[PDB]
Design a protein around this ligand. Structure first.
Ligand SMILES: C=CC(C)(C)OC[C@H]1O[C@H](O[C@@H]2C3=C([C@H](C)COC(C)=O)C[C@H](O)[C@]3(C)/C=C3/[C@@H](COC)CC[C@H]3[C@@H](C)[C@H]2O)[C@H](O)[C@@H](OC(C)=O)[C@@H]1O
Ligand SMILES: C=CC(C)(C)OC[C@H]1O[C@H](O[C@@H]2C3=C([C@H](C)COC(C)=O)C[C@H](O)[C@]3(C)/C=C3/[C@@H](COC)CC[C@H]3[C@@H](C)[C@H]2O)[C@H](O)[C@@H](OC(C)=O)[C@@H]1O
Ligand SMILES: [Mg+2]
Ligand SMILES: [Mg+2]
Lengths: 4, 233, 233, 4
């Protein structure tokens, strides 16, 4: 999944 | 440290040069030097610090995952201790970088951070680096590391909700990462999904208040929330 | 060195793991350790050595170019010594890596290399690393460095022509890189073009002798020759 | 230009  | 003799302004300048050159190890060292001058960081400077270490640790995480997987496949012909040794080497270096970042946050970025923008930023970082420690933790202390990540994200969340609009990018990125923590580390996929949805929905409802550039900034991180929701549901 | 206590076979194994993980600095250190065991390298091992250092130095070259350009634009508002300092830092580290590789070739890879495949391979490397030294050289010794690159490429070329078929990939890659040396370093674009053309044409004429896999191997490097010819004419 |  994506994080920033 | 080794940057003790360099002017703070020179360290920041060189951090920016290192970013342009994609020299993230150097960038991180320059920013560590700048933090160790003892002055608070500006918004731009905080971002330089985060980007530098995110890229350094990002590379280490990607390599660790490649190695850990090779290792797992080895433990399903006997190749000897080399895969484990080299995974351990990368792991130890990753742990080192995380400990360095956490050390900077503890000495003394968090304690001097009074404004919401800075305090939330540093607590999110604290959550993130404990999350990276958690990803490789297997000893007894996996739990305490996980709780340390959770505690830092929670404090950041409590502040962000009281002091920032729902579209604030730090608030959005914090929620994004806390939702990842829930899904990947805390074995709480429902909480992850609930957090990502609520965050996305509350941001959408506040977009009307924004300028064209803020709207672009907010919608971008919103898209990352949407991407996770699509992957998870 | 620091790899003195590790088995040669373990160093090679870890070099391969480092490649899979895109950890080229580690890969290079493992291969340096393996070379320092004092045994000749196999074909596969030579390739591991080359790939490791090519990637390390490649990153340094790319960063140096970004910095050197920023520097050149600064010398067309006064920003102080920082850009020059940081370019010099990257330059010195690049020089260091090149000196390390050249040292390995001199102690004692080249002297123990009897077969054409190994001797041409190591002399090409010698040409390549002196070429990288030349790219950043500005002092009096730019000329001697350039001549050192030229001498090594020439010796490699003489051997390759006598002992290898025109489609041999090492021979092709040597010619490719010597043609780049002529164009970018020696201010000899006509020689570069002539070399690339002759090499391409002589390889084409020998493709009929190859298996399907060799043909694929040879045509690939031929395409790089073609790409340069297209850029240069 | 390209090298190998
Ligand atoms: C520091 C390096 C540079 C490249 C100069 O800037 C990084 C970025 O710095 C700012 O963006 C931050 C920011 C990021 C943005 C989402 C990037 O957006 C775009 C449009 O590229 C990602 C970065 O890693 C950074 C600094 C980090 C965080 C993160 C920090 O956790 C502690 C929380 C969310 C996010 C916040 C702080 C963003 O505001 C800016 O708003 C961005 O500018 C634009 C055009 O939106 C710029 O790309
Ligand atoms: C060492 C690392 C790995 C990735 C395992 O192998 C690198 C590569 O090693 C071999 O290829 C060499 C080789 C390269 C090939 C052109 C790559 O081809 C393909 C199909 O990817 C580039 C590499 O950097 C390498 C090792 C270097 C050289 C260069 C050395 O100068 C001193 C001269 C030309 C070229 C020669 C030695 C090539 O034979 C093999 O023939 C390649 O396999 C195939 C499928 O062609 C493999 O990708
Ligand atoms: Mg303060
Ligand atoms: Mg021999």
């Amino acid at each position: 999944p994506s994080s920033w | 440290g080794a940057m003790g003799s360099m002017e703070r302004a020179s360290l920041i300048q060189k951090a920016k040069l290192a970013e342009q050159a994609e020299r993230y190890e150097d960038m991180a060292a320059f920013m560590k030097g700048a933090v160790e001058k003892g002055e608070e960081l500006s918004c731009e400077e905080r971002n330089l610090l985060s980007v530098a270490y995110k890229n350094v640790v990002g590379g280490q995480r990607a390599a660790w995952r490649v190695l850990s997987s090779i290792e797992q496949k080895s433990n399903e012909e006997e190749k000897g201790p080399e895969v484990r040794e080299y995974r351990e080497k990368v792991e130890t270096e990753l742990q080192g970088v995380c400990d360095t970042v956490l050390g900077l946050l503890d000495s003394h970025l968090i304690k001097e951070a009074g404004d919401a923008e800075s305090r939330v930023f540093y607590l999110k970082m604290k959550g993130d680096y404990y999350r990276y420690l958690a990803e490789v933790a297997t000893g007894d202390d996996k739990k305490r590391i996980i709780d340390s990540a959770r505690s830092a994200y929670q404090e950041a969340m409590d502040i962000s909700k009281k002091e920032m609009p729902p579209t604030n990018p730090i608030r959005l990125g914090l929620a994004l990462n806390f939702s990842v923590f829930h899904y990947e580390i805390a074995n709480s996929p429902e909480e992850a999904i609930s957090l990502a949805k609520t965050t996305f929905d509350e941001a959408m409802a506040d977009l009307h208040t924004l300028s064209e550039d803020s709207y672009k900034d907010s919608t971008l991180i919103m898209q990352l929330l949407r991407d996770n929701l699509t992957l998870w549901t």
